[PDB]
Amino acid sequence: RAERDISMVVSGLTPKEVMIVQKFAEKYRLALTDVITEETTHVIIKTDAEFVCERTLKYFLGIAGGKWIVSYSWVIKSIQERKLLSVHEFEVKGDVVTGSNHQGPRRSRESQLFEGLQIYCCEPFTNMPKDELERMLQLCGASVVKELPLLTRDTGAHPIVLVQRLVMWDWVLDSISVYRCRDLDAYLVQ
């Protein structure tokens, strides 16, 4: 059961912690990039003691792609053991919103969402850029709607318009966080 060469990305880490991962990578010849590429296999992110992390773009992109989401602690502990530990016991269990009982990273990883849905991101967005939200959507199988009306581009699926038919974007984050297409009703603004 041998596979893929390890290429990591790092998330939610302070510059000092980033530097600690950079040297750790060199010591074990682990690839490490600044942005998530096609080769990315692991997203190393800061977690509390319960393997719960902060919601970041890479975390969502990580789950969307069924990647290994690993606690920075895997790095700190494999450094004090002198050996390259297995990532398994350090897999992120959830984020600050989900808590640790749903194990979304693992569910997404082992099972590998918006298949057959027509979704449009309405320009005004707070946290992340419209460009990356659409990237996330495509990764989860959504038919990303670039412009309204759909005209000949229409698949027949009643569009979902993500904001701030009309749905809060948190619907996307929550669905990815627990790797489950959530019920839209709770997120409709209109």
Swiss-Prot record:
BRCT domain ranges (all copies): 1-92, 111-189
Localization annotation: Nucleus; Chromosome; Cytoplasm
Post-translational modification note: Phosphorylated in response to IR, UV, and various stimuli that cause checkpoint activation, probably by ATM or ATR. Phosphorylation by AURKA regulates centrosomal microtubule nucleation.
Entry remark concerning the domains of this protein: The BRCT domains recognize and bind phosphorylated pSXXF motif on proteins. The interaction with the phosphorylated pSXXF motif of ABRAXAS1, recruits BRCA1 at DNA damage sites.
Function: E3 ubiquitin-protein ligase that specifically mediates the formation of 'Lys-6'-linked polyubiquitin chains and plays a central role in DNA repair by facilitating cellular responses to DNA damage. It is unclear whether it also mediates the formation of other types of polyubiquitin chains. The BRCA1-BARD1 heterodimer coordinates a diverse range of cellular pathways such as DNA damage repair, ubiquitination and transcriptional regulation to maintain genomic stability. Regulates centrosomal microtubule nucleation.
Subunit structure: Heterodimer with BARD1. Part of the BRCA1-associated genome surveillance complex (BASC), which contains BRCA1, MSH2, MSH6, MLH1, ATM, BLM, PMS2 and the MRE11-RAD50-NBN protein (MRN) complex. This association could be a dynamic process changing throughout the cell cycle and within subnuclear domains. Component of the BRCA1-A complex, at least composed of BRCA1, BARD1, UIMC1/RAP80, ABRAXAS1, BRCC3/BRCC36, BABAM2 and BABAM1/NBA1. Interacts (via the BRCT domains) with ABRAXAS1 (phosphorylated form); this is important for recruitment to sites of DNA damage.
Protein name: Breast cancer type 1 susceptibility protein homolog
Organism encoding this protein: Rattus norvegicus (Rat)
Full protein: residues contained: 1591 to 1801 of 1817
